[PDB]
Write an enzyme that holds these catalytic residues in place. Structure first.
Site, PDB file in Angstrom:
ATOM      1  N   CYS D  41       0.853  -1.203   0.000  1.00  0.00           N
ATOM      2  CA  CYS D  41       0.000   0.000   0.000  1.00  0.00           C
ATOM      3  C   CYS D  41       0.885   1.248   0.000  1.00  0.00           C
ATOM      4  CB  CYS D  41      -0.992  -0.010   1.141  1.00  0.00           C
ATOM      5  SG  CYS D  41      -2.150   1.331   0.976  1.00  0.00           S
ATOM      6  N   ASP D  43       0.166   3.753   1.715  1.00  0.00           N
ATOM      7  CA  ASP D  43       0.068   4.190   3.137  1.00  0.00           C
ATOM      8  C   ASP D  43       1.464   4.558   3.645  1.00  0.00           C
ATOM      9  OD1 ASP D  43      -0.076   4.037   6.115  1.00  0.00           O
ATOM     10  OD2 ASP D  43      -2.168   3.608   5.699  1.00  0.00           O
ATOM     11  N   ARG D  45       2.718   4.655   6.411  1.00  0.00           N
ATOM     12  CA  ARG D  45       3.189   3.839   7.558  1.00  0.00           C
ATOM     13  C   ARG D  45       3.777   2.506   7.085  1.00  0.00           C
ATOM     14  NH1 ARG D  45      -2.536   4.391  10.482  1.00  0.00           N
ATOM     15  NH2 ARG D  45      -3.039   3.857   8.325  1.00  0.00           N
ATOM     16  N   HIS D  97      -2.190  -4.289   4.967  1.00  0.00           N
ATOM     17  CA  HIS D  97      -1.887  -3.745   6.320  1.00  0.00           C
ATOM     18  C   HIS D  97      -3.177  -3.436   7.042  1.00  0.00           C
ATOM     19  CE1 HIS D  97      -2.646   0.572   5.615  1.00  0.00           C
ATOM     20  NE2 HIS D  97      -2.559   0.072   4.416  1.00  0.00           N
ATOM     21  N   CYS D 100      -6.117   0.081   6.804  1.00  0.00           N
ATOM     22  CA  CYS D 100      -5.981   0.476   5.373  1.00  0.00           C
ATOM     23  C   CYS D 100      -7.176   1.345   4.979  1.00  0.00           C
ATOM     24  CB  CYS D 100      -5.842  -0.736   4.452  1.00  0.00           C
ATOM     25  SG  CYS D 100      -5.516  -0.227   2.730  1.00  0.00           S
TER      26      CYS D 100
HETATM   27 ZN   LIG Z   1      -3.547   0.999   2.774  1.00  0.00          ZN
END
Ligand SMILES: [Zn+2]
Ligand SMILES: [Zn+2]
Ligand SMILES: [Zn+2]
Ligand SMILES: [Zn+2]
Lengths: 209, 208, 209, 208
Positions: D41, D43, D45, D97, D100
């Site tokens: 992803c 993302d 993080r 993850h 999400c």
């Molecule tokens: Zn995500």
């Protein structure tokens, strides 16, 4: 009042009956294999059915129709059609046909958000940006025609930025053509769609694999 | 030269249309109002307006290799958005056909370059239905996988909020056909799903 | 013992242990919600891990990495990342980072067919065609650098031909940046990516919703 | 602020790398030999190289919204072709993850513009598993759909001749993970398929 879907299936049966009566060899001979010499890339607009407006028959025109006859270079939908037509059917002609009163071209000249249409129409907005002063100098109806023409010419450039097309142009004189369809008259007109021969040399160097 | 021959036939056709339907082209120039969106194969033997016995203005058309609906394909996505939301077609028809070169390609194991990613949905159906397809002759498998592709296309078509909205709001209908290139006949597919199916799809896909 | 996958899972657990020991509040506070100020669009090249080369932490950089950091205008993959980063996370900076020794840029300057890479690399071949004389005047190694820079600048243009980006630039001062990463030195260098002011005016007119 | 701060931290990082791994940057100047393709992803993080405790040169990386594999997506398609055929990675990892945003968007019914077509595969899994997901809390459903998305991604990843060729020829492995953004731990998913499954996939997808 009539269900247009049911009416269409009944008219299909009448058309199949007319084929069987007037040209009984046509459909069975086409079932053995298609050999069209023309790839048509045009608009989904219901007023631009290629086989009807060309006075042709089933088996004559291999066809792709999308919103505003747009060629995105990396679009698999047009990419797969062009690969199949050019390499596998060995068409002699690729035609990109734009049309007057194109809703996709008109959408690109507006500034309303149209959801999933927005990414689709980006190539038309790129042409609008590049030609903005020229288009602003025209009436709304003239701008829709001018941008439709600029879109056909840009599509012919995108079409030739493909190794499969450049190979066919060198190997068998494959031709590419830009048309505008006038929805009000039924007539196709050819676009000049000139490029210096310098242009195709640079394209060959840059794209042939 | 088929291109110059086609331009001459176009001029003859347009002249004949003006004589035999003098109001048609001028009324179409004002605006299109097709009631049908056709999604079919690019195959030269499947020209929608001719095989349906219809006229210009009747069928809003998308044709691609093997009438495949990739869920996130912007080409079919934009056509469906325009047809359903802007033109308000009453019917969406997915039409597959016999002797489809894309369907046949998917049943073979030759690499076809840019066609390979395009044909993945047909190979996914081949994998899912492998025992059933292997039980058939090549010619029977080309028909069967063509039918499976139309039915999967109708599912993909309905996994779109624009379509689900139109089905509930204004009674949009969706239909699957197979065109026999040898007979000229369209056959309707059963294309059954439990009503349970559309309920889960509405929950999962319809957005506010 | 030679398996890089099992070695990576063991190093992950060592990294989780180091986080717990040195900064025990970091991961639990990030789990409440991310607030990155940077969207990074870079190459998949293993030598260009954005968070490492920027000396930053988890939560700092919302990331898209693809072959040769190419922005196809109608690519939903980059399109969805840009929409999410700009509209929903409200990043303050969009960075397009190209790099030296880019295999995708080098592929575009060659004439070998690379299957599914061919349509992906078309925008690089379009830049090659447009700048062919300039690139032919350079050594192979200089041409790879020059095309890498032209690709970042073209990406920034494509990035600003998106209403969501133009809206953020006008409404909240979103900035866009072009970088080249030198894989041999570890240093990022900024590209000018200046545009005639006429250009941005026409883009606003042509693309803002 | 953060952009100029990041450029200064980059120069400091490159200086420190020259001192603490003096051979690394000169070896990377000439080429790369990662053994891992990571698909994860976007993302912020989930930075693969950091959470794996690895270095530049170790992980060929694709990151998109919710680590979604659309079968005919050229973005992921081009990455997979380059990593598997040209770099000859030994491992392909799909990492989903917890928490999400893309998975959570798919479980909601808000329209999100260009994200809507992108998220279709997640909504297809939501439809297929609707009863199961409705039986869970919001937070449990986001984890469950994240796991279902990784497993579906591994299927899509293997419906590619380039991957199947590498699995048969050189023992390429594929792996599904979930990253817990709150703990820093990667968890391996069971991601079992009958061996029957991969045989039908080989038949249906491997080019001659
Ligand atoms: Zn995500
Ligand atoms: Zn049109
Ligand atoms: Zn076909
Ligand atoms: Zn690169």
């Amino acid at each position: 009042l009539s269900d247009k879907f049911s009416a269409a299936l009944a008219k299909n049966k009448e058309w199949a009956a007319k084929c069987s009566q007037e040209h009984p060899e046509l459909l069975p001979t086409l079932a053995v294999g298609q050999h069209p010499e023309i790839l048509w890339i045009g608009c989904s607009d219901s007023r631009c059915p290629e086989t009807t407006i060309l006075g042709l028959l089933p088996g004559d025109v291999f066809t792709h129709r999308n919103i505003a006859n747009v060629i995105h270079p990396a679009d698999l939908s047009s990419g797969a059609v062009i690969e199949f037509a050019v390499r596998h059917l060995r068409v002699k002609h690729v035609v990109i046909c734009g049309h007057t009163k194109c809703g996709g071209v008109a959408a690109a000249l507006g500034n309303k958000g149209l959801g999933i249409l927005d990414p689709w129409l980006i190539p038309l907005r790129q042409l609008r940006e590049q030609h903005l002063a020229e288009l602003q100098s025209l009436s709304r109806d003239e701008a829709v025609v001018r941008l439709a023409e600029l879109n056909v010419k840009e599509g012919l450039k995108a079409l030739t930025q493909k190794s499969v097309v450049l190979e066919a142009m060198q190997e068998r004189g494959l031709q590419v053509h830009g048309l505008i369809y006038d929805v009000g008259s039924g007539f196709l007109r050819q676009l000049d769609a000139a490029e210096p021969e310098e242009a195709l040399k640079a394209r060959l160097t840059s794209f042939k694999t």
